[PDB]
Structure 1
Amino acid sequence: ECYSDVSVHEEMIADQVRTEAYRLGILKNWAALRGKTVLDVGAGTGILSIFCAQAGARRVYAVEASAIWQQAREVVRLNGLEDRVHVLPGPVETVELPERVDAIVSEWMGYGLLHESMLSSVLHARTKWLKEGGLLLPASAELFVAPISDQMLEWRLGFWSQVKQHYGVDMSCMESFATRCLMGHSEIVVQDLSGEDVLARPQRFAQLELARAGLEQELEAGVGGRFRCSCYGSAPLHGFAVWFQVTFPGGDSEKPLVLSTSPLHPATHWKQALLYLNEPVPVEQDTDISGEITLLPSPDNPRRLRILLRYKVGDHEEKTKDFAMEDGSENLYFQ
């Protein structure tokens, strides 16, 4: 039977930004991996564990709790690596490896970075299995926020005011209703934007070094920060977009590899996480926007992402909106 959704896995590998960033980021670290052992947390179809072997790792432990672990084992064997790469079913928290490892690799990032991510699992595996001084791939993550005028949203809202010119029936009254429906909710919306949509310079509001003491406690407390920016020009402000990048150490190239999900960079399967205001706000060149954004666990469920937004536009009063990912949203690691 088909428990995993094959279409999620093909979208992962069809994401050439993601796949080549990992391939090259792993290869950059040849000197550290050469003849060493690796734990791949959440190995999926196995492609990253095989990249590690191809980068010269001696042994790779590919741990995967989903149904797809079976396919990973077949992929490993098909590439003649069954000797070197061992696929282990189940959560990393209770697997037993025969040895501690020199490195951990993982595709752990969720939508919004921290929705249904495997970061907690990576941190647990680091604590339990990673040797002193060991390597983490990627090693860090950064979080960004920017105000947006979503041109696609603008088009959908204004579309009702356009019906008269195409069919001779005025439907501009439908715009209020469309606004309430499309913006008057507190759901985090996963959608891809372009640079067209970015309304002011993006602001880094958090940085996470995976090896650093205290990170798991920070995750429970909330990952966030204040921000301030000035709008590029006149537009309807629709809200904010959140995205991330992760960085692979450069190894002997001394050039880190950055995998970005910015709308100013090539699209990826993570898209961006959109936080819409209840309705559009007109802004102008040099309109000031400040606030604070915090990524939080939900109370019911720590891997359900909550985002608490405080914002102030120009002279308006500061407002707050508390967002969360919907129950029925798209899945990556927990299908």
Structure 2
Amino acid sequence: SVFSERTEESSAVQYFQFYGYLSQQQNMMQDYVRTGTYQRAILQNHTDFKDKIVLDVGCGSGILSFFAAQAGARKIYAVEASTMAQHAEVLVKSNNLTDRIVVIPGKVEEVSLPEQVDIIISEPMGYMLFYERMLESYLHAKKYLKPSGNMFPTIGDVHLAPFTDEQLYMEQFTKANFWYQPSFHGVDLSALRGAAVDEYFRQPVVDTFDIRILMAKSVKYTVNFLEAKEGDLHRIEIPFKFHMLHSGLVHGLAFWFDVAFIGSIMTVWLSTAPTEPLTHWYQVRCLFQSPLFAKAGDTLSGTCLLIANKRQSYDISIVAQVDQTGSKSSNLLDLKNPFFRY
């Protein structure tokens, strides 16, 4: 299938094994901003669900399907590839909703549905939106969408902005410099120091931060889920040109995302911005191994390029330059191996 072809089997088994556990579901369910905002988006847009046919892509425990049922959906196909499908089935029965919610075990790229749907609902967003490549599965599912069907969420905005955080920078640097030791119990480790540095700086940093570290207004990159195709997400090129508001060392770029549920009654936003209450997505920072000095009024331009790999992730290339001085930094990150700093 389209899933097995883009996904090395060892990565797929690990991914679905992880989402099979109830403890993991509990952790996600306890994000009240996430769960409450989804419920509000669906219930306040009840006319988008009332007597409709719906597809829930990667339903997990089933909660979004339950919200669709509360909003009056006639039928909800709830697709789930992990063993969480069986637990969702238990909930559908114990909540007396077997007349409305039909769990379909398997990958959305592989199952067969009996009819086309009015609306697709999902939570495909990983860290910095793209982590884990579930957006592709969400877009793949549009093969089941009727003409003029809706998607919830409808659009995603990724935000990026340059930051200064000496302290985060020194922490990661200090760890790599363990390998600058000429006599670790008599052994010279220093030949591996560059490799060690590269490995640490390749890890995106998942945690939150004060907005005062941000040195320019964010640049926004939008994915319209109604219009994008799966293959659009294999290579994502995000140009940027920042007008620097503060002078200092730029240690990297910070990322967050918002999604909008554009319903008939209203648009509901779910934001993971650092100006908003914390979610289990936190925010993500990509460090530069060599920081860039810039003054307020300078332009910091470059490109953030995400290249999908078969480990169900992306290799991230970031090249940035201070236009006024020609100072450049170029950096590679492995979105599969984040540093969970919180």
Other-structure match for 2:51:
35
Displacement of 1:264 in angstroms is 1.9
Pairing 1:17-166 to 2, within 5 Å after superposition: 17-127=33-143, 129-150=144-165, 153=168, 156=171
Other-structure match for 1:271:
282
Other-structure match for 1:233:
246
Distance 1:329 1:158, change over 3 A: closer
| Native 8 Å contact 1:151 1:197 kept in 2 | no
Q: 2:313 aligns with which of 288, 299, 304?
A: 304
Q: 1:13 aligns with which of 24, 29, 34?
A: 29
Which residue identity does 1:289 align to in structure 2?
Answer: L
> Structure 1 residues 15-24 or 91-100, which shifts more?
91-100
Q: 1:80-116, CA deviations, whole angstroms, 9 ceiling, x for partnerless residues? A: 2122111121111222222221111001111221121
Separation of aligned partners in 2, 1:183 and 1:235: 26
Q: 1:201-252, CA deviations, whole angstroms, 9 ceiling, x for partnerless residues? A: 1111x2111121x5223212x2222211233324432100122211101322
Displacement of 1:194 in angstroms is 3.0
- How many residue pairs align between the two structures? 303
Separation of aligned partners in 2, 1:189 and 1:157: 10
Other-structure match for 1:224:
237
Separation of aligned partners in 2, 1:96 and 1:203: 40
Separation of aligned partners in 2, 1:317 and 1:159: 24
In structure 1, runs of 5+ residues without a counterpart are 161-176, 331-335
> Structure 1 residues 38-47 or 69-78, which shifts more?
69-78
| Native 8 Å contact 1:28 1:251 kept in 2 | no
Other-structure match for 1:250:
263
Other-structure match for 1:195:
211
Which residue identity does 2:108 align to in structure 1?
Answer: V
> Structure 1 residues 110-119 or 3-12, which shifts more?
3-12
**Given the alignment of the two structures, is residue 261 of structure 1 paired with residue 272 of structure 2, yes or no?**
yes
**TM-score, normalised with respect to structure 2:** 0.80
| Native 8 Å contact 2:288 2:330 kept in 1 | no
Q: 1:132-155, CA deviations, whole angstroms, 9 ceiling, x for partnerless residues? A: 211111111112110012365168
Q: 1:258-298, CA deviations, whole angstroms, 9 ceiling, x for partnerless residues? A: 11122122211112222101144444433431111122202
Other-structure match for 1:323:
333
| Native 8 Å contact 2:169 2:287 kept in 1 | no
Displacement of 1:27 in angstroms is 1.7
Which residue identity does 2:161 align to in structure 1?
Answer: A
Distance 1:321 1:182, change over 3 A: closer
Separation of aligned partners in 1, 2:123 and 2:100: 20
- RMSD value, Cα: 2.6
| Native 8 Å contact 2:173 2:197 kept in 1 | no
> Structure 1 residues 40-49 or 270-279, which shifts more?
270-279
Displacement of 1:159 in angstroms is 9.9
Other-structure match for 2:8:
none
Which residue identity does 1:308 align to in structure 2?
Answer: S
| Native 8 Å contact 2:68 2:76 kept in 1 | yes
| Native 8 Å contact 1:28 1:249 kept in 2 | no
Distance 1:184 1:111, change over 3 A: closer
